[PDB]
Structure 1
Amino acid sequence: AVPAPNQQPEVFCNQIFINNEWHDAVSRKTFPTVNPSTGEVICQVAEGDKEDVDKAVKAARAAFQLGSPWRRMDASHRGRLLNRLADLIERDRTYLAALETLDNGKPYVISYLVDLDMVLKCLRYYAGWADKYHGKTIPIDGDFFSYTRHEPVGVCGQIIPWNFPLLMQAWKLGPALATGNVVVMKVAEQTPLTALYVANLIKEAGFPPGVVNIVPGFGPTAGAAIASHEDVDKVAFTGSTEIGRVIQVAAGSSNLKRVTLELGGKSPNIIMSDADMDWAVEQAHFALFFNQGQCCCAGSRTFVQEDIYDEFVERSVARAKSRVVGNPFDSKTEQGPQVDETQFKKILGYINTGKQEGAKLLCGGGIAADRGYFIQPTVFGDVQDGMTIAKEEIFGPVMQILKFKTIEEVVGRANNSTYGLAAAVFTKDLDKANYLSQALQAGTVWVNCYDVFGAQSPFGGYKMSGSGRELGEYGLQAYTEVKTVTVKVPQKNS
């Protein structure tokens, strides 16, 4: 079931979080955060900039000093704190889900059943890793005792997007804190509220001051300040491929800080002729339209084998036309508004480009409401690889259906992209499944399913969809600095 929401939840936090205290921007400047469903301003938020970032970094660095409460804390206790933070989030689940929906636009039912649940599972998962990421005792040559210490990388700058505000924060905080690092987080200007409230919970949980610092603000200012900072040891970024470049260049230009990127995609969803029609159709719909189509791993290239193409398209169009668009607080709503005006216009622009280039508009294609940033579930058929809607990430409710003949053909076409975040394969055949999962150049390959995330399984991109991995044990690698200690001994023995 799902508890009734407060459609107009009160905002308790809207400032910069440093040393477990709330601060106004040094410039005293604030920026408005809008409710995408109405287009009206929710409240003002402290606009952090370079100077505010500097304050946050110094606080983090201080909390990371040898002998500090955070450094001396037992690894198991860090796990205890993460579990406490999770318990607190669960206590304030209904409120957080409502505030998430208010600032993001996604359906309250989803924020409660999906986003929040995943946030809880992510933090609790990593909570258990806190005291289990062992170093090694190595059998080196000669009379020596060699071993490695898995230490925290240090002050970690984390910049996250707006599509999954709370979840993105969880994916970043979970591994970082589990391994004993300190954080200076830069949340999206479109969705700063939920993350800021969580900071209050981090304080309530008992995390030492300076361990987690959140600086709301713009990208070119606050974000770039973190990426170019001389005292930030590592930066984790999740967003567009274009900005990912800026981040890596900034890291190489400054202090050569370690970098991991989770960028965009143009994920291919391959439906073989032997697939379960009903299942594939529903999953292909979910694969694309999930979260208003604002998912980095969205199945934006639906490949369908010719023998079943016509039927698949017919069923897909019907499903899209039946997709309920409206008030995200209404239990019947399947699709809310896009995050903001910029995205709203961007998507309409892509739809226009799709029409211009010859793609067959099967349904939707325009605005779905007079107020808010609602867009009709759109489906394009007979899409070709060279079309703009087949190459660029739309990040909206715009489905692309392409036809193919052979398995060798679809492999080449699916892999012919600078992106490689994810891919899916729908088939009943064992050999086909194995052939494709191996051949596909993507960080995650789903078989007879889509958007199946687990805190236990790593997620990340190939090619220009990013570098490094998040979630699972792999998610701890980027947050660890390996130290080798080689000691001379009297006489080494096996």
Structure 2
Amino acid sequence: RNLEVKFTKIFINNEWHESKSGKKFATCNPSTREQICEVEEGDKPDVDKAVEAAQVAFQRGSPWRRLDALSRGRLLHQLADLVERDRATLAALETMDTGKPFLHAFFIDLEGCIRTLRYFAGWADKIQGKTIPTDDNVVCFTRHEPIGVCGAITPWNFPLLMLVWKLAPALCCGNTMVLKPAEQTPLTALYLGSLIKEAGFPPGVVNIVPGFGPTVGAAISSHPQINKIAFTGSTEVGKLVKEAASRSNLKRVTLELGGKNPCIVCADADLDLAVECAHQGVFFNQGQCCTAASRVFVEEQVYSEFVRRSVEYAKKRPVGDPFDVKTEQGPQIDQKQFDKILELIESGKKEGAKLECGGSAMFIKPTVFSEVTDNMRIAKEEIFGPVQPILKFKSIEEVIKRANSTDYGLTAAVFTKNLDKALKLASALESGTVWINCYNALYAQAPFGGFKMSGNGRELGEYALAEYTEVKTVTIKLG
């Protein structure tokens, strides 16, 4: 209920720290506008410090480096155990900090945090190079060593999850990390730093430096002693991080960004499954989600009954308090976007699109657009709010071209009972994940990540391990 925030400082070498400037910023609560607490405002000197602590704890011969590969997973299981223990604490904090429904934060976010952690615990002693057939007198092989100090920079929509998805793989491969969390949502990250010292990782293996994007985050992406970065958030902000990494240190960068992620309904598709899952992927977590559906193509044979059954759904879903055990949808975080959404609601009005339900606030009331075309703004642009822009199509080959036309591509969900229509579509769509008769079906063992401008690199899979290893070749010649 009323839960005290106990950790608010820079986490470095498993000791709690103050800004080298003593500056502080103050996270608030989107549910009820209320300053939660005051967190230390780190910055380049603070970063500079943690990055050194990471280099030391990564140095050869350190207690971290010498750990038996399986004891690396022992820790990772220990940390997951702890997360498991203090689970609702985290769900509570993550709710206070983001305004997610407390259950949503308890059964999705933290279930994902716990599962993702143990999955990569598995991999710690299964990271295998190759032994390669070359010449008769030559032993050749490759090792998959850890890259070094790893930079993690995450968004406020799934703070602890987006954070674990980078921490779990990075630590099993045996890097050390400097973590830098949103400003909107720094609480759960800072908690996990307690759990990290408790499970007993060596000091300096993980370090957290909360603060601001252009200050702290930008210090990371430019730092000469960080060897890799993982970023989850804004397309355009990723562009800069890639740039800075390139200008300084040539570090390895992997990004996960947004997208106009399509949602395709065929004539023979289960309609209640299609309509409802199209709903879960436009209105879940208040519409702000890496996996949200910018576009919803529907074949002419089921258009109106699709559009009709859709508007029935929007009006019945409960809004209100986040600690509500009867709600689905809390508030938005930063009104900076609140403006441009219910502006975009007029974009479709202005270009000739029927608005079948909703279109203003009370939060925003869930909205639905029929008669939408491709060229309208409300189908050209990502929307971090509930806006269901429903289009129409004759051919499978038609919607293939239409849905693939944007420069983004992180998610596509297809709905059909037909075997040929399922597979033909999946193979064609230029999307990192293609879901079929389901939405937001993320698993810790299937890689997530972007095609085209939705990012580069993958996360959550055996493929994740690639982004946290440098491949060394040994080539030995005998006499």
Which TM-score band (shorter chain)?
A: over 0.9
Deviation at 1:126, TM superposition (A): 0.3
Question: Could you tell me whether the CA contact under 8 Å between 2:294 and 2:381 is conserved in 1?
Answer: no
One-letter amino acid matched to 2:149: V
One-letter amino acid matched to 1:158: A
Deviations 1:435-473 (A, max 9, x none): 000010000001111110001000111000000100110
Structure 1 spans left out of the alignment, 5+ residues: 1-5, 369-373
**Residues 68-87 of structure 1 aligned to structure 2 (within 5 Å):** 68-87=62-81
- Which secondary structure does the structure 1 equivalent of 2:373 belong to? coil
- Counterpart of 1:99? 93
Q: Among 134, 140, 145, which residue is 1:146 paired with?
A: 140
Deviation at 1:142, TM superposition (A): 4.2
CA distance in structure 1 between the partners assigned to 2:311 and 2:273 by the alignment: 15
The structure 1 segments of at least 4 consecutive aligned residues displaced by more than 4 Å after TM superposition are none
- The count of aligned residue pairs is 479
1:13 and 2:34 are equivalent in the alignment: no
Deviation at 1:346, TM superposition (A): 3.2
- Counterpart of 1:3? none
Deviation at 1:298, TM superposition (A): 1.2
Q: If the length of structure 2 is used for normalisation, what is the TM-score?
A: 0.98
- Which secondary structure does the structure 2 equivalent of 1:464 belong to? helix
CA distance in structure 2 between the partners assigned to 1:344 and 1:168 by the alignment: 23
**Residues 111-126 of structure 1 aligned to structure 2 (within 5 Å):** 111-126=105-120
Deviations 1:67-111 (A, max 9, x none): 000100111001010111111011111111111111111111111
CA distance in structure 2 between the partners assigned to 1:313 and 1:397 by the alignment: 15
**Residues 151-300 of structure 1 aligned to structure 2 (within 5 Å):** 151-300=145-294
- Counterpart of 2:321? 327
1:88 and 2:89 are equivalent in the alignment: no
- Which secondary structure does the structure 2 equivalent of 1:213 belong to? strand
Deviation at 1:357, TM superposition (A): 3.0
Deviation at 1:360, TM superposition (A): 2.1
Alignment identity in percent? 67
- Which secondary structure does the structure 1 equivalent of 2:240 belong to? helix
Q: Among 305, 313, 320, which residue is 1:311 paired with?
A: 305
CA distance in structure 1 between the partners assigned to 2:57 and 2:167 by the alignment: 16
Deviation at 1:403, TM superposition (A): 1.4
Over aligned residue pairs, what C-alpha RMSD do you find?
1.0
- Which secondary structure does the structure 2 equivalent of 1:33 belong to? coil
CA distance in structure 1 between the partners assigned to 2:296 and 2:216 by the alignment: 37
- Counterpart of 1:476? 465
Structure 2 spans left out of the alignment, 5+ residues: none
CA distance in structure 1 between the partners assigned to 2:152 and 2:88 by the alignment: 26
Deviation at 1:356, TM superposition (A): 2.9
1:63 and 2:63 are equivalent in the alignment: no
Q: Among 417, 420, 428, which residue is 1:431 paired with?
A: 420
One-letter amino acid matched to 1:417: T
- Which secondary structure does the structure 2 equivalent of 1:207 belong to? coil
CA distance in structure 2 between the partners assigned to 1:200 and 1:307 by the alignment: 56
Q: If the length of structure 1 is used for normalisation, what is the TM-score?
A: 0.95
Question: Could you tell me whether the CA contact under 8 Å between 2:372 and 2:391 is conserved in 1?
Answer: yes
Deviations 1:135-188 (A, max 9, x none): 111112241111111110100011011110111111010100010000001100
CA distance in structure 2 between the partners assigned to 1:346 and 1:126 by the alignment: 39
One-letter amino acid matched to 1:134: Q
CA distance in structure 1 between the partners assigned to 2:102 and 2:140 by the alignment: 53
- Which secondary structure does the structure 2 equivalent of 1:43 belong to? coil
One-letter amino acid matched to 1:489: L
Deviations 1:214-252 (A, max 9, x none): 111111111111001111100111111101110111111
Question: Could you tell me whether the CA contact under 8 Å between 2:65 and 2:174 is conserved in 1?
Answer: yes
Q: Among 5, 16, 27, which residue is 1:22 paired with?
A: 16
Moved more, 463-472 or 139-148: 139-148
